Amino acid sequence: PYLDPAVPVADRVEDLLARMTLPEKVGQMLQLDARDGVGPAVLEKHAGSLLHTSPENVLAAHELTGRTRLRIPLLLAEDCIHGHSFWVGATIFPTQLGMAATWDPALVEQVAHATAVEVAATGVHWTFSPVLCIARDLRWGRVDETFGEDPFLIGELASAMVRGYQGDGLSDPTGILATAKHFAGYSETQGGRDASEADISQRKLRSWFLPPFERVAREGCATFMLGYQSMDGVPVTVNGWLLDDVLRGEWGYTGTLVTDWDNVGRMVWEQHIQPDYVHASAAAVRAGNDMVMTTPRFFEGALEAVDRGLVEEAAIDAAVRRILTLKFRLGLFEDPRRPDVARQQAVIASAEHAAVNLEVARRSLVLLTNDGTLPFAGGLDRAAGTPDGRALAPAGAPARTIAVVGPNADDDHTQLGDWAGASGQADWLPDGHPREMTTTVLDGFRALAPEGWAVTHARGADILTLAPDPEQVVVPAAPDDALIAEAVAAARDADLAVAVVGDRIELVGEGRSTATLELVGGQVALLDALVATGTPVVVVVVASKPLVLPPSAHAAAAVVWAANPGMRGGQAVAELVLGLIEPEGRLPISFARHAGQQPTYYNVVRGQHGVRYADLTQSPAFAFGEGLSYTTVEYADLRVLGTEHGPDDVVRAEVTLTNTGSRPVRETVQVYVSDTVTSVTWAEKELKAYRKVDLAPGESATVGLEVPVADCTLVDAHGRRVVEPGEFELRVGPSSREDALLRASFTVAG
Amino acid sequence: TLPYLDPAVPVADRVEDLLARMTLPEKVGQMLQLDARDGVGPAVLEKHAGSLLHTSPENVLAAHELTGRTRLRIPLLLAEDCIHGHSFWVGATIFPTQLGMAATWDPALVEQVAHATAVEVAATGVHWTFSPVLCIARDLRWGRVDETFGEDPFLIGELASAMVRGYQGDGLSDPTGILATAKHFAGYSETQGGRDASEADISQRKLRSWFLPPFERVAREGCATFMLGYQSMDGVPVTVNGWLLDDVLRGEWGYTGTLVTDWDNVGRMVWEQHIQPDYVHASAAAVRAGNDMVMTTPRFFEGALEAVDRGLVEEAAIDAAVRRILTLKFRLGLFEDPRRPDVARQQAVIASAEHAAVNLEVARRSLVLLTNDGTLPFAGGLDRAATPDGRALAPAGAPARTIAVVGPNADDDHTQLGDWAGASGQADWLPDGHPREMTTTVLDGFRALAPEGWAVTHARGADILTLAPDPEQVVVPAAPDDALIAEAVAAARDADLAVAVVGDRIELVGEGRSTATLELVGGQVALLDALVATGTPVVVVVVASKPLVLPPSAHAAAAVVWAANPGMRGGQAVAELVLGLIEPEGRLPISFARHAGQQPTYYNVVRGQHGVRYADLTQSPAFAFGEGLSYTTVEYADLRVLGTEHGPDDVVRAEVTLTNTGSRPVRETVQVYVSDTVTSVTWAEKELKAYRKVDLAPGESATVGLEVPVADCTLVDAHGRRVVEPGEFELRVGPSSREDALLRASFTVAG
Ligand SMILES: [Ca+2]
Ligand SMILES: [Ca+2]
């Protein structure tokens, strides 16, 4: 009756519990690295799930499920972080950080739905995405995986990811399981280091880290993944307050828990908080973990531990019931969702996914400075009716030369970013994705420049080499005079130098936090040399995360932030520089002037004696929310409609935008709420709403804005999130800069 | 009886007799500590103040007269910031900052410093110093790092405990003993961004783990008073943190001294932080949390009176605060002798020769030699005529040498004394600071000690900064100055040695003056680059409030000396060290970062990290806690634990053997670290628990006993209990906290 598709879900559970040995129950809780060997994992360890399953291993795995005793269908899971990361011909979208600059949840939902379509066609049921970590220390190596530094915007974009992945539910053939990842606090640890200690109190976690996670818990995220880090001395894997009080108790979450990579084992060898594997296993079960990821010795460990009474098997059964409940709900015992090669050739890298990718890439680029040089030569047009052709030479500019230079100008691996292609986590595509699927900046300019223009190229700098540890280690490359001289010569015979700079994979991700936030290698010397030629320089930053830029970049003619823009990124950069699209992106994260300047996120807590460091301003180099267009927009008449509010009312306001320049714009209006006096220290302001507004040149619009009063909360001492009565200020404008915000007062009372 | 005037009556009975005679306004008055500069008349009579600070000699003698016209004639506590010497008394002995004295690793010497300070302080009629600081330097960006004893909780406790003992003398009743204060309780030093009084993201377990230990120690050893800092912590102003100010300080520790706020803490809660709607509510909240004395919030008077009247606080809680304040005045014997100033006493003890000699010794033992390619001791070492104190003799083979003494801190009087001294700015009455002739700068030291046939030249080679009005007071870093650099270069090119004295200055230091980059500001890096390139050996002497990132030219210079604001005698000590008239003894009490983004760089990091370096930078500090060279080599060997099984009440005993394999005498600082191999909660990978100084003549070997009480091998568990957990430990012993310099031996504890 456990194969009986009419017997309801709950009965086939203790039925299949009754036919499971104990080694197979402990197995059902496992998720093993298939890159080792699907044979041992499905057979000798009776695994309930596999990850990192190469295309040859996936078909193999279904085949071993047939030779087994009860043939329980596996959950096949993969990191599909921004596209189907490790599938040779898949659409690789911008990173999560790049996507956040669109401020566009509807588009991000499209990205997630396009990714799931491609993932399910390869037989994977479950992605470890989205990432809800909040980017509060820029030294952290995994900032590229976040949606930036704001909890409201993170929850907006992560909610859109979860919707797009999971589709119409557990029966949808192109729906997959999403994962709310790194619950919680993993992004802000000592020194910006990877999985160092998170000095994070319960109130601080509640204040800045949990809101996005609570949002997607209640919207139905199928699974949650536990972070690596220890918080207040306790690894999250055994943190009962977070897993029991908060996640199960307060929020009533009913989805499945998975640990991160060998969380259980690291309690022994890396945090040194468990003496041995038998007790790590026991503690993990006690804490309420459902799925245990790549701690293979949890098999023997969880078995020896039930065998000596440390954990009673009535708990090993607590997890296996919630896991198998998920498997029955998906239909996996009657349709295990095998890879479909005909479906793969129809949908993977289809034209409709490349068009989603192109749109996200174009909207994600942020123009940060512009002295008038852009749009180049005044802006180009394509031939009328040809939305895909070369630009035509513009009136008054028949022959221009564009020199495209810098280490990232023609580097498609860096442009795709971490968790994609050859980034390192998968060993079955060490060439990466096919080069012809990625348009680099150099490619974009060669494809789009008019027939009569020239595009030249010069590497101008190297970033790094690798060396053995002067007790594997990054060695920054020297400035190289001949390499710089060749780029300076190209710039001097050019009308425009496009310098593409940033980081690359050895300076990014797990175990690869950075201290300086600076450009490594010869890049600074190259920027200095280019700018000193007097040819106008556009700096294009292709990088995982905000970097301290040298003074030569602030003296450059324009600066564009591209944040790992995916496969179509280089086309988007050229279209922006040439005026073939209007800039739309807005920063989801702030830029420090120096690593010692941190914290530089916009919602810092009221406090301080002083306003500046004695050697340095506290103003960020670029603030959350900014980004130019190719026009001007004036914000005029901010007024609240009705200034009194009760606790479950809505704050309604109006503001008036006028496009006072010559080009259309899609403007991103940002609504911040400031709680003027608080009974506990709080953020000076917090983002609560935003609106995109389309304006033709000369057009005015009066825009309605609203914020629920129930979102104007703070977290009191004791951890209750409450609306506290009194005065508030509504602040509305084109970024988080105080000198760019209009302000209107309002009141909450009882 | 009249009982409170009867010295044969027990103190607690006198306190109750006086308390019962006081009106409510007099009780509230007694909790006021007011700035004497705002008018002594209304403070003492109209408001019945218990305490005054910043009291001029005229105001001291006027305050005693006004006390004589009050009903109860309750003597005043006169308090002052006496931070490293009698900071704001024109001719007083100014010692190194706490950061400087911490490099001595010498509690007995630090006790002498505090006792000599208290002698000078008590002669001016002051009863009470807001010192020592027990803040722990966990973020190098913080502007007040110079006020701390460095980054280690054990050594902070050692040196703070020594300062309390020295200050408070042989019992309150000793005429040269003053009240000590345990300063900035607690967590004030680790705030967001290293900024001053920003938010402290410090949970209860974190406070108990790294911040409370020195305070608990000095509480149980009888520190007279505790003082709050400024920051809010996990949302709550510390001024209203009942958990800390009551449950911990009274409940868990049994402390009976007086808790005073920091400057206008109660007021700030209204007009600055807007955490309290008015002064009646701020007053009530401060009292309910456990504060006994309110510093410079004069509206606390009406506020507290109104809060009692309206039922916001009980009179009984006012009573409890007044009982602790009166207990201190009775224990000082102020009701029988109010300790008036004595000018004959001042003239005999302030800046005496004994006090100058304590100063010289602490200056000498505090200098830290960080690098030395063998250029030092210069010309192989000098001797004084066979007149210890006096000019040096030219050594054999070096009849004529020129030392070029360069750099902006080479003759800067005020920068050498550091913050909280002289004209540092907290006293608007020392505008010129302390008399120039009382400080030997580095330039002075070399002019006074160089042999007759040698020459000392001088060239300021760089400036650090100018000031400018803010866009609307703002530091503008000075440009490298080509002609100024060239004058120093020309002095070094016609010298045998360049001594480049660099670091920071007061506008880059202290309250409201955190730094982000930790680098040398101004033309200093350009000066060092040009000096090293001349080929003349360069000694870099860092006179600075706190560890700074040094340029690569410093790491290529012949030698680096860390001096940390070394006080009035510092220049003499620096000249003596370079010339070999003393042996280097100082050891770092704090770690130096290579970059601000490298932090944390303190030695006791909580283990847990995936990885061991940043992708662009090693996590190895530039200079580690406990390092420092001498002029000889010392070899460590055969660390052995004498019995490895221990119970909860045992002592871990060990031996280690040291050999002075060099040719010069050395006083070596052996450090003992304890690592708890498996913990129930993540913990520091090692912690300092003991040290020992060992004198070794050249060629001498010594086998040295070592011990750590088992009861000191604690962690703070989940639940916040500080406990010894049973299991395995490792003892690590060596000349610094660098792992590659530590012998290790295992031992175990059974519970
Ligand atoms: Ca409010
Ligand atoms: Ca242990």
In sequence order, what DSSP letters do the residues of A552-601 get, joined into one string?
Answer: HHHSSSEEEE-SS--TTHHHHHHHHHTTSS------SS-B-SSGGG----
Expressed in angstroms and rounded, the spacing between residue A744 Cα and the centre of ligand 1 is 15
- Under an 8 A CB cutoff, do A229 and B205 touch? no
3-state helix, strand, coil in chain B (%, to 5): 35, 20, 45
Residue B301 CA to ligand 1 center (angstroms) comes to: 27
Q: Do B235 and A596 touch (CB under 8 A)?
A: no
Half-sphere exposure of B681 (CA within 13 A, CB side): 22
| d(C-alpha A580, C-alpha A388), whole Å | 11
Structure tokens, B429: 């009455």
CB B304 within 8 A of CB B313: yes
Within 8 A of B507 by CB-CB distance, chain A residues are 614
Provide, as residue numbers in chain B, all residues whose Cβ is less than 8 Å from the Cβ of A604: 192
Question: Tokens representing B257?
Answer: 């001294």
Residues in chain A closer than 8 A to B677 (CB atoms):
272
By CA distance, what is B510's nearest residue in A? A614
Residue B232: φ, ψ to 5°? -90, 150
Among B418, B416, B421, which Cα is nearest to B440's? Answer: B416
Rg of chain B over Cα atoms, rounded to whole angstroms, equals 27
What is the Cα–Cα distance from A267 to A286, expressed in whole angstroms? 14
Place of tokens 């108790």: A249
Report the DSSP pairing between strands B666-676 and B687-696: antiparallel
The whole-angstrom separation of Cα B466 and Cα A199 is 39
Q: How far is ligand 1, taken at its centre, from the CA of residue B13, in Å? A: 48
Q: How far is the CA of A644 from the centre of ligand 1 (A)?
A: 14
Contact at 8 Å (CB) between A559 and A374? no
Say how far apart CA B415 and CA A546 lie, in whole Å. Answer: 38
Q: Which CATH number fits domain A25-76+258-333: 3.20.20.300, 3.40.190.290, 1.10.260.30, 3.30.1330.10?
A: 3.20.20.300
Is the CB of A613 less than 8 angstroms away from the CB of B274? no
Provide the edge-to-edge strand list for the sheet that holds B743-749: B645-646, B743-749, B727-734, B666-676, B687-696
Residues of chain A with CATH 3.20.20.300: 25-76+258-333, 79-228
Query: How far, in Å, CA of B456 to CA of B464, rounded?
Result: 23
Task: State the DSSP string of A124-157.
Answer: --EE---B------TT-TTGGGS--S-HHHHHHH
Contact A229 B608 (CB under 8 A): yes
- Interface contact flag, B611 A197, Cβ < 8 Å: no
- Strands B77-80 and B383-384: what pairing? unpaired
Peptide bond into B600 cis (omega under 30): yes
Mutating which of B612, B616, B683, B738 best tests the A interface, going by the most A Cβ atoms within 10 A? Answer: B616
* Chain Cα centroid distance, residue A41: 31
CB B733 within 8 A of CB B639: yes
Residue A166 and residue A605 in contact, taking contact as beta carbons nearer than 8 Å: no
Q: Where in chain B is the domain with CATH 2.60.40.10?
A: 634-749
Of all residues in chain B, the one with the smallest CA distance to A596 is B516
Contacts of A505 (CB under 8 A, 6+ apart): A413, A414, A418, A423, A424
Return d(Cα B631, Cα B579) in angstroms, integer: 11
The domain over range A365-587 is classified in CATH as 3.40.50.800: no
Resolution in Å, one decimal place = 2.4
Residues with CB under 5 A from ligand 2 (ion): B 676, 678, 725, 727
The DSSP element (H or E) to which B457 belongs, if any, is strand B455-459
User: Which of A270, A507, A610 lies nearest to residue B195, judging by beta carbons?
Assistant: A610
B615 and A474 within 8 Å at the Cβ level: the answer is: yes
Measure B230 CA to nearest chain A CA, in Å.
9
Asked if B389 contacts B448 with a C-beta cutoff of 8 angstroms, the reply is no
Asked if the Cβ–Cβ distance from B598 to A515 is below 8 Å, we say yes
CB contact under 8 A, A597 and B516: yes
Sign of CA dihedral B716, B720, B724, B727: negative
Q: What is the DSSP code (8-state) at residue B444?
A: H
Using an 8 Å CB-CB cutoff, list chain B residues near A270. Answer: 607-608, 610
Compute the Cα dihedral for A45, A48, A54, A57 and give only its sign.
positive
Q: What distance in angstroms lies between residue A250's CA and the mean position of ligand 1's atoms?
A: 25
ω into A94 cis (within 30 of 0):
no
Class of the CATH-defined domain A633-748: mainly beta
CB pairs under 8 A between A and B: 216
**CB within 8 A of A252, min separation 6: which ones?**
none
B609 contact residues in A (CB cutoff 8 A): 193-196
Angstroms from A91 CA to nearest CA on chain B:
29
Q: Residues A652, A657, A661, CA angle at the centre, nearest 5°?
A: 170
Contacting residues for A114 by C-beta, under 8 A, at least 6 apart: A91, A93, A164, A352, A353, A356, A357
Task: Tell me the nearest-neighbour CA distance from B465 into chain A, angstroms.
Answer: 10
- Residues of chain A contacting B509 with CB distance shorter than 8 Å: 614
Distance from CA of B503 to the nearest CA of A (A): 13
Identify the residue whose tokens are 């005073």: B260
Nearest neighbour of B595 by CB, restricted to A232, A516, A604: A516
Which of A473, A608, A614 lies closest to B475 in CB terms? Answer: A614
* CATH number assigned to the domain covering A79-228: 3.20.20.300
The dihedrals phi and psi of A404, each to the nearest 5 degrees, come to -100, 120
CB contacts of A272 in chain B (<8 Å) are 607, 677-679, 682
Task: Name the residue type at position B75.
Answer: P
Burial class (CB in 10 A: 0-12, 13-18, 19+), A610: middle
Which distant-in-sequence residues (6+ apart) come within 8 Å of B484 by Cβ? B459, B460, B461, B462, B463, B523
Q: Which CATH number fits domain B634-749: 3.30.10.20, 2.60.120.330, 3.90.1200.10, 2.60.40.10?
A: 2.60.40.10
In chain B, CATH 3.20.20.300 covers 3-347
Question: Residue B140 corresponds to which tokens in the numbers above?
Answer: 């190098």
| Segment (H or E) for A281 | helix A277-287
> Closest-CA residue in chain B for A509?
B615
Cβ A121 vs Cβ A340: under 8 Å: yes
**Token pair of B560 as six digits:** 């680096």
**Are A596 and B236 a contacting pair at CB < 8 A?**
no
**Cα–Cα nearest to B150, from B133, B140, B137:** B137
Min Cα–Cα distance to chain B from A284, Å: 14
Could you give the C-alpha distances from B667 to A85, B98, B149, B587, in angstroms and in order?
A: 61, 21, 21, 11
Tell me the HSE value of A252 on the side-chain side, using a 13 A CA sphere: 3
- State the Cα–Cα distance between residues B707 and B690, nearest whole angstrom: 7
- B3-347 belongs to which homologous superfamily? Glycoside hydrolase, family 3, N-terminal domain (3.20.20.300)
Write the CB contacts of A6 (distance below 8 Å, at least 6 apart in sequence).
none
B367-590: CATH, from 2.60.40.790, 3.40.50.1700, 3.40.50.1390, 3.30.300.30: 3.40.50.1700
Alpha-carbon span A132 to A184, nearest angstrom: 9
List, by residue range, all CATH 2.60.40.10 domains of chain A.
633-748
**What is the experimental method?**
X-ray
Cis peptide before A479 (omega within 30 of 0): no
Q: Which of A195, A598, A717 sits opposite B193 (nearest CB)?
A: A598
User: What's the CA-to-centroid distance between A587 and ligand 1, angstroms?
Assistant: 28
Q: Cβ of B596 and A599 within 8 Å?
A: no
How far apart, in Å, do the first and last CA atoms of chain B sit? 57
CA-wise closest residue to B98 among B564, B571, B748, B512: B564
Whole-number Å distance between alpha carbons of A694 and A582 = 12
Contact criterion met (CB < 8 Å) for B517 and A596? yes
DSSP symbol at A92: B
Ligand closest to the CA atom of residue A275: 2
Angle, vertex CA A645, rays to CA A640 and CA A646, nearest 5:
160
- The CB density around residue B64, as the number of other CB atoms within 10 Å, is 18
